[PDB]
């Protein structure tokens, strides 16, 4: 794929209406663009140069993609303060928090549908030769129509701190990040979904998680999870990365459970 540069949006085109959260780099707003509803992420007052670079850099990576299950970037304001990233609006926010609120409410069919969309976004990303490295329910956003979309491309790169509980053993131990380590992470996301937003490995420390992983531990079947879905997450957690399904396999497997 050919590299894209980021669309610059004029400040007068953006209207912030309400605060909808606190971000890594500053406040997040709901507002309007041009008009269409958008999420508007701002860069905090007193930002450092590194923060500016990382803020706009993540947006640039997100902007490489055009897929229904990857957050759409409208553009950035980088020539004016406050600097902003403008994306599609996701009314229901982060997937982990959304499921905790809706604990036990969804059908298995609906949870599978949500996972199928996430897998489709990842299949697309993998085919574009990108590894995400930070795939986790907290980094997936949910819109009013229950569509789940991959967000948070800070660690993403073409094929420092890492999210240990979501990371494959070979990526933890040997710095080997591939689409197959993203598949491991997807398995963790499946577990987060089927548990309605339980924390992977509960309150074990990172060192304890690493030891558990190295000892062959796998997270247990979520309450009332169908065997076929638990087996799929177990397949995503094959110790040897070459033996995990590809995202194309995952999409096909989930598709067949949509009945």
Q: Name the residues annotated as catalytic.
A: 134
Q: Is 26 annotated as a binding residue?
A: yes
Q: Is 213 annotated as a binding residue?
A: no
Cα dist from 133 to 99, 116, 122, 185, 242, whole Å: 22, 19, 11, 8, 17
| Residue 16 DSSP symbol | E
Q: Is 149 annotated as a binding residue?
A: no
> Strands (DSSP E) along 78-224, which ranges?
84-88, 93-94, 130-131, 140-142, 148-150, 157-158
How many helices (H) and strands (E) in the chain? 8, 10
Q: Is 46 annotated as a binding residue?
A: no
Instruction: Please confirm whether the linkage preceding 165 is cis (ω < 30° from 0).
Output: no
Q: Is 216 annotated as a binding residue?
A: no
Return d(Cα 117, Cα 93) in angstroms, integer: 16
Q: Is 24 annotated as a binding residue?
A: yes
Q: Is 160 annotated as a binding residue?
A: no
Q: Is 23 annotated as a binding residue?
A: yes
Q: Which of 201, 183, 126, 118 is nearest to 156 (CA)?
A: 126
Q: Is 161 annotated as a binding residue?
A: no
Query: Quick count: other Cβ atoms within 10 Å of Cβ 207?
Result: 9
CB 76 within 8 A of CB 40: no
Q: Is 258 annotated as a binding residue?
A: no
Q: Which residues contact 153 (CB under 8 A, 6 or more apart)?
A: 58, 61, 62, 132, 134
Binding site for ATP: which residues? 20-28, 41
Binding site: which residues? 20-28, 41
């Amino acid at each position: 794929a050919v590299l894209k540069f980021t669309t610059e949006i004029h400040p007068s085109c953006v209207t912030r209406q309400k605060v909808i959260g606190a971000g890594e780099f500053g406040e997040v707003y709901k507002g309007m663009l041009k008009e269409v509803p958008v999420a508007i992420k701002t860069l905090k007052a007193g930002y450092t140069e590194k923060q500016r670079v990382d803020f706009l850099g993540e947006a640039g990576i997100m902007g490489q993609f055009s897929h229904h299950n990857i957050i759409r970037l409208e553009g950035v304001i980088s020539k004016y303060k406050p600097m902003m990233i403008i994306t599609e609006y996701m009314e229901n926010g982060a997937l982990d928090k959304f499921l905790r609120e809706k604990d036990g409410e969804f059908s298995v069919l609906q949870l599978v549908g949500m996972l199928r969309g996430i897998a489709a976004g990842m299949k697309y990303l993998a085919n574009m030769n990108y590894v995400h490295r930070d795939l986790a329910a907290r980094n997936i956003l949910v819109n009013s129509n229950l569509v789940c979309k991959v967000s948070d491309f800070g660690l993403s790169r073409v094929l420092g701190k890492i999210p240990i509980r979501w990371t494959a053993p070979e990526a933890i131990s040997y710095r080997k990040f591939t689409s197959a380590s993203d598949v491991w992470s997807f398995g963790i996301v499946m577990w987060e979904v089927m548990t309605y937003g339980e924390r992977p490995y509960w309150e074990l420390s990172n060192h304890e998680v690493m030891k558990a992983i190295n000892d062959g531990f796998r997270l247990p079947t979520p309450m009332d999870c169908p065997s076929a879905i638990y087996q799929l997450m177990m397949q995503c957690w094959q110790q040897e990365r070459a033996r995990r399904p590809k995202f194309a396999d995952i999409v096909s497997i989930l598709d067949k459970l949509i009945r």
